[PDB]
Write a protein that binds this ligand. Structure first.
Ligand SMILES: CCOc1ccnc(CCNC(=S)Nc2ccc(C)cn2)c1F
Lengths: 517, 399
């Protein structure tokens, strides 16, 4: 039936020659039954002692009988690489709604698909005889490197047809499962499902009958899927007074997963508990704010919320909010407030940044995510005004582009906290910094610093200058580094020094910063 | 078919496919399906683990989609094959032509086919993806123009003698046609060429001509002010000092004296006699490129771009730091669209001048460039590129 895929061993290498380890007589018995069986079903075939290849076999015990488990580690190491099977799974928000849905288990998949004839000789294995004084495979063996790939590749061609005569039916293959969904009415649907099973059968492929099948709703990769809505499986937040680093990590973990749908989840406080921890089993007492967070998450988590599916007929709308310094939340909907999916972006790119960059970046992250799930970019609703954005844009040396977006008056609004003058200020004192400074007005200060780093000393200077200067002030620095950082007009930083500066900068009426060699 | 092979030891590209929009995917499916029916390409099995990213791009003023395959990786690993008319740049007008379609008439070495595998991706992973491999010389592959040269030479034989007044250069899927005729008598010669090629080709770059004698270079330029404040001078010294690297004849000793002591930034300073002459001399030294900078073919061409603002950009093509071979400006869209136009423009130039693409250094976040570059790209080649963060000082010393 189904065409054979040419297989070959890696360049220069040769089939495996691994001696079969000792097998008890009871197992030796179990195998000869299993194998003799598989020789009858064409899956394997006795060969002549010309085949110097061999792969060790061993029997494993939920009845009294055993099952053959062939160890292909060697062959696999010697077999060519293949086009890897899909690594990623469709995210629910990318599905459309459906009336009926059926999952079909495809038993002994690899067992029904031919193996390249020229390759079989390499799958040789031996079954020792108890009498004190060999086969090869003719199909895809379990545990072999190239089976998950060729099996999929097959089923696809196998499905191609039934797929063209039923463009209304939707099929998705995942390992040995076949999820089929449609908008047929119950009856017709199940009937089509029935045709599918025949078609799969005509190629020796066998599946479960309606009674033993799996039907909505059903878990799947930590989700809980219905034909009309979706969500996450029941997350239980433990109740106790003694938390270990592990628990906290696991919880934080569980908390994150949940935010792709539960808006408002917060972990900042939980995650501060891990600071300086010495051992996975160390017990960290919950602080007041952590307890307040936990409890708030519990609340949010008690009353479930589902997401609706993607309706390709309508637009994707994305809205973003600033939920704290360095924290952003977003939701993508089509019908007003009817979420397909939500999420939060906390990623800081670089040691210093401002809300305009972060926002923009979150936008890029959201855009990318959307192209992957829906294959289009959403129209954004941003808490930033066109002019504010544009002002930061042109003043920045890097280039960027935000797709279709419209200001949404939803405080807090993102803005720039200060703007360096474009030219030196008349009548504003001039400070020359090098740790100290000298002004034109004669004043000066010199301070000593223990525990520092050349470049931190540089920021220190500037700092002093800002402190002792009036509401307007010109500052001349030699440090191109300090210049660089302040030029980018950061409003948030990893360093406290930069953060103090920024504070100062926000208080001034006019600051001019220049550099000289 | 000619038995092409990879550089010794090297294997085939296994390049990750950047995700696409339902819009491009559709186009690529229509296009490929047509290419399949004509045996240009073929579906492939899981026994082929290679991969080259593919993209769909819009043909300028044509409404039709173009399949753009990024064989950069394959090309680097494709064996070298064993010339550039320094005259082409001298011509007054040059029209670029897309002779890519010629390749489709030449079968590709059967054992090389697997390396041209590429994939049409899917939305949200709903399905593994269409996999294909080329049966003919693929557009964009270093190997095509080579394996087709001979045939391309023969086919250009007539026009070449019937019009030895126009130079014809070939680079990848493009034909660079230079001449000095009049823009009308020129477009006609290009068309006769087109009709000729049809005998055995869309215009690129607006169907328009580049005009390559004006490719102007750009000096460093010092401010020309009435009154000079402490700030101005400081900035002036800074810039000069930088340029001091390239042009050693630059002096600042006299300017720096105007900046002795700690004066206020806005204090207007009268330039002494000594100083005034030092400036003007610095000014003269800057009016022309530093002498002794020669193109070395055995070295890479690097292009570095800076964003100036207001839709203005600056770039520099060199091989060794400071040793600039060319410098220019580009002005308006949106940041990305511009940068992609600039890139395509600077590339074209490099191709016309030195017969090769330069490595770019782009001032943009990778994820962002990867997202919209294909929205405005129109060339058929793809330069190599890395992403960077330009310092406020470098930009502060150009344009
Ligand atoms: C458990 C989810 O299974 C699937 C995953 C990926 N694709 C399919 C087929 C297409 N299904 C679509 S577009 N919709 C859809 C709607 C609801 C449910 C419960 C399953 N699928 C699936 F049925």
């Amino acid at each position: 039936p189904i065409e054979t895929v040419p297989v070959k061993l890696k360049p220069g290498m040769d089939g495996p020659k691994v001696k079969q380890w000792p097998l008890t007589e009871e197992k030796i018995k179990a195998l000869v039954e299993i194998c003799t069986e598989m020789e009858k079903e064409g899956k394997i075939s006795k060969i002549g002692p010309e085949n110097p290849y061999n792969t060790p076999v061993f029997a494993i015990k939920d009845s009294t009988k055993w099952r053959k488990l062939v160890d292909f580690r060697e062959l696999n190491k010697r077999t060519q690489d293949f086009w890897e099977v899909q690594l990623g799974i469709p995210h629910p928000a990318g599905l459309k709604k459906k009336k009926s849905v059926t999952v079909l288990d495809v038993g002994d998949a690899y067992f029904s698909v031919p193996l390249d004839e020229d390759f079989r000789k390499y799958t040789a294995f031996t079954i020792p005889s108890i009498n004190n004084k060999r086969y090869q495979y003719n199909v895809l063996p379990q545990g072999w490197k190239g089976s998950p790939a060729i099996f999929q590749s097959s089923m696809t061609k196998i499905l191609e047809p039934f797929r063209k005569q039923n463009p209304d039916i939707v099929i998705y293959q995942y390992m040995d499962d076949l999820y089929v969904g449609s908008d047929l009415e119950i009856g017709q649907h199940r009937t089509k499902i029935e045709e599918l099973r025949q078609h799969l059968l005509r190629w020796g492929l066998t599946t479960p009958d309606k009674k033993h099948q799996k039907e909505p709703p059903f878990l799947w990769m930590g989700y809980e899927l219905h034909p009309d809505k979706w969500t996450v499986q029941p997350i239980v937040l433990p109740e106790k007074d003694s938390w270990t680093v592990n628990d906290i990590q696991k919880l934080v973990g569980k908390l994150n997963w949940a935010s792709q749908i539960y808006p408002g989840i917060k972990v900042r406080q939980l995650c501060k508990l891990l600071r300086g921890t010495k051992a996975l089993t160390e017990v960290i007492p919950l602080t007041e704010e952590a307890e307040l967070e936990l409890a708030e998450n519990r609340e949010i988590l008690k009353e479930p919320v589902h997401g609706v599916y993607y309706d390709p007929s309508k637009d994707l709308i994305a809205e973003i909010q600033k939920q704290g310094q360095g924290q952003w939340t977003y939701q993508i909907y089509q019908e007003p407030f009817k979420n397909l999916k939500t999420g939060k972006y906390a990623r800081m790119r670089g040691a210093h940044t401002n809300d305009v960059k972060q926002l923009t970046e979150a936008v890029q992250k959201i855009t990318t995510e959307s192209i992957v799930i829906w294959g289009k970019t959403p129209k954004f609703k941003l808490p930033i005004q066109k002019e504010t954005w544009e002002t930061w844009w042109t003043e920045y040396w890097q280039a960027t582009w935000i797709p279709e977006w419209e200001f949404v008056n939803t405080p807090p609004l993102v803005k720039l906290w200060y703007q360096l003058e474009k030219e030196p200020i008349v009548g504003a004192e001039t400070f020359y910094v090098d740790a100290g400074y000298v002004t034109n007005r004669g004043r000066q200060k010199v301070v000593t610093l223990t525990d520092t780093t050349n470049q931190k000393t540089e920021l220190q200077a500037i700092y002093l200058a800002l402190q002792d200067s009036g509401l307007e002030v010109n500052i001349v620095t030699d440090s191109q580094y300090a210049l660089g950082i302040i030029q980018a007009q950061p409003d948030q930083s990893e360093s406290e020094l930069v953060n103090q500066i920024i504070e100062q900068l926000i208080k001034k009426e006019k600051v001019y910063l220049a550099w000289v060699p | 078919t000619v038995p092409v092979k990879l550089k010794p030891g090297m294997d085939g590209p296994k390049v990750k496919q950047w995700p696409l929009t339902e819009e491009k995917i559709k186009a690529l499916v229509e296009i490929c399906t047509e290419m399949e029916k004509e045996g240009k390409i073929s579906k492939i099995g899981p026994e082929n683990p290679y991969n080259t990213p593919v993209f769909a791009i819009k043909k300028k003023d044509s409404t039709k989609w173009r399949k753009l395959v990024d064989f950069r990786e394959l090309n680097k690993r494709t064996q070298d094959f064993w010339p550039h008319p320094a005259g082409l740049k001298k011509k007054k007008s040059v029209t670029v032509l897309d002779v890519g379609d010629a390749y489709f008439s030449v079968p590709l070495d059967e054992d090389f086919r697997k390396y041209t595998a590429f994939t049409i991706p899917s939305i949200n992973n709903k399905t593994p993806g269409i996999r294909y491999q080329y049966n003919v010389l693929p557009q964009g592959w270093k190997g095509s123009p080579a394996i087709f040269q001979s045939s391309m030479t023969k086919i250009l034989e007539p026009f070449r003698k019937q019009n030895p007044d126009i130079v014809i250069y070939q680079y990848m899927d493009d034909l660079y046609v230079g001449s000095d005729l009049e823009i009308g008598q020129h477009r006609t010669k290009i068309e006769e060429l087109r009709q000729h090629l049809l005998r055995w080709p869309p215009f690129l770059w607006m169907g328009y001509e580049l005009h390559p004698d004006k490719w102007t270079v750009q000096p460093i330029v010092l401010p020309e002010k009435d009154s000079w404040t402490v700030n101005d001078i400081q900035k002036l010294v800074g810039k000069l000092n930088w340029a001091s690297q390239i042009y050693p004849g630059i002096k600042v000793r006299q300017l720096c004296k105007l900046l002795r002591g700690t004066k206020a930034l806005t204090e207007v300073i009268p330039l002494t006699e000594e100083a005034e002459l030092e400036l003007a001399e610095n000014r003269e030294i800057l009016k022309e490129p530093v002498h002794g900078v020669y193109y070395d073919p055995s070295k890479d061409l690097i292009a570095e771009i800076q964003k100036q603002g207001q839709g203005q950009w600056t770039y520099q093509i060199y091989q060794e730091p400071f040793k600039n071979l060319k410098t220019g400006k580009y002005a308006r869209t949106n940041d990305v669209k511009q940068l992609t136009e600039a890139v395509q423009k600077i590339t074209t130039e490099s191709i016309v001048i030195w017969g090769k693409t330069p490595k770019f250094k782009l001032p943009i976040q990778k994820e962002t460039w990867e997202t919209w570059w294909t929205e405005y790209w129109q060339a058929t080649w793809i330069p190599e590129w890395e992403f960077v963060n330009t310092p406020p000082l470098v930009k502060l010393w150009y344009q």
